[PDB]
Design an enzyme around this catalytic site. Structure first.
Site, PDB file in Angstrom:
ATOM      1  N   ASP A  10       0.940  -1.114   0.000  1.00  0.00           N
ATOM      2  CA  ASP A  10       0.000   0.000   0.000  1.00  0.00           C
ATOM      3  C   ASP A  10       0.989   1.173   0.000  1.00  0.00           C
ATOM      4  O   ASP A  10       2.165   0.964   0.292  1.00  0.00           O
ATOM      5  CB  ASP A  10      -0.848   0.042   1.263  1.00  0.00           C
ATOM      6  CG  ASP A  10      -1.588   1.366   1.418  1.00  0.00           C
ATOM      7  OD1 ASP A  10      -2.326   1.791   0.480  1.00  0.00           O
ATOM      8  OD2 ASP A  10      -1.427   1.979   2.495  1.00  0.00           O
ATOM      9  N   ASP A  12       0.295   5.126   0.904  1.00  0.00           N
ATOM     10  CA  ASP A  12       0.086   6.128   1.977  1.00  0.00           C
ATOM     11  C   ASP A  12       0.058   5.540   3.386  1.00  0.00           C
ATOM     12  O   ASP A  12      -0.664   4.594   3.672  1.00  0.00           O
ATOM     13  CB  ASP A  12      -1.215   6.907   1.747  1.00  0.00           C
ATOM     14  CG  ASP A  12      -1.279   7.465   0.399  1.00  0.00           C
ATOM     15  OD1 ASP A  12      -1.831   6.753  -0.474  1.00  0.00           O
ATOM     16  OD2 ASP A  12      -0.754   8.593   0.186  1.00  0.00           O
TER      17      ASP A  12
END
Ligand SMILES: [Mg+2]
Length: 258
Positions: A10, A12
């Protein structure tokens, strides 16, 4: 014969700290000045989109909500875009498709030639503002990026390990982030997926589709979407909540020889 691992990341608050600078969540959780946090957060945001609009045809490609850069490579004739004039090429659905593919490929070219020379891409004086921003950010985040990179680089150097990125961020903006946060070198562009449209479990399924069933997939992330999608496909999930978790990961990467 070698066992092979595929790391699905992922972006952020997993690999980088950006959104949480604007919400005050980071500054709050780690006792940092909220005012500086927001200032730093907004400057990066400006740099991200300025790069996106200025070099990655973002004003054009934004409404296309594409998943992977090569998604429209059917309509790419493969000509040299060095001298091609995108601005004055009038940018339908078939003669238009070739012009779209041209932009995504030029984006890909920009990425590969500047992934290790981002200052060369954004040019001066932005380069210096960037280096200072990156330094301010690295200090306020207590070396978060330094931590995620140690793991990313170990995966990269390791022969039977691969780095994949699945972010809900739109594709072009996501590439701008990756570049500005110095991740261009660790992430091959054909490994970035934008789940803004399809959703993450779609991208996950597609990624398994691409790498096969014999590969061991590890879903790494701080959020639920990522974790929930890992469940659907019974893919081991590694949650990142702090620097410590990124260290635990690096440690595990360091003990195995495939
Ligand atoms: Mg996240």
């Amino acid at each position: 014969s070698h066992m092979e691992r595929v790391f699905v990341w992922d972006l952020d608050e997993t690999i980088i700290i950006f959104h949480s600078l604007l919400t005050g969540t980071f500054a709050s959780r780690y006792g940092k000045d909220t005012t500086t946090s927001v200032r730093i957060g907004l400057m990066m945001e400006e740099m991200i989109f300025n790069l996106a609009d200025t070099h990655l045809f973002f004003n054009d490609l934004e409404d296309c909500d594409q998943i992977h850069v090569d998604d429209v490579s059917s309509d790419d004739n493969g000509q040299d875009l060095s001298t091609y004039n995108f601005s004055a090429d009038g940018f339908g659905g078939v003669d238009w498709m070739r012009k779209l593919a041209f932009r995504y490929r030029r984006v890909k070219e920009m990425y590969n030639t500047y992934k290790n020379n981002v200052g060369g891409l954004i040019g001066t004086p932005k380069r210096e503002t960037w280096l200072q921003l990156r330094a301010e950010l690295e200090a306020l985040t207590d070396l978060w990026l330094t931590h995620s990179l140690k793991a990313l680089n170990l995966i990269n150097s390791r022969p039977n390990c691969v780095n994949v990125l699945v972010t809900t961020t739109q594709l072009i903006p996501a590439l701008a982030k990756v570049l500005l946060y110095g991740l261009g070198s660790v992430f091959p562009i054909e490994n970035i997926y934008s789940a803004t449209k399809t959703g993450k479990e779609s991208c996950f399924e597609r990624i398994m589709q691409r790498f096969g069933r014999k590969a061991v997939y590890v879903v790494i992330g701080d959020g639920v979407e990522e974790e929930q999608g890992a469940k659907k496909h019974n893919m081991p999930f590694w949650r990142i909540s702090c620097h410590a978790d990124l260290e635990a990961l690096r440690h595990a990467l360091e003990l195995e020889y495939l």
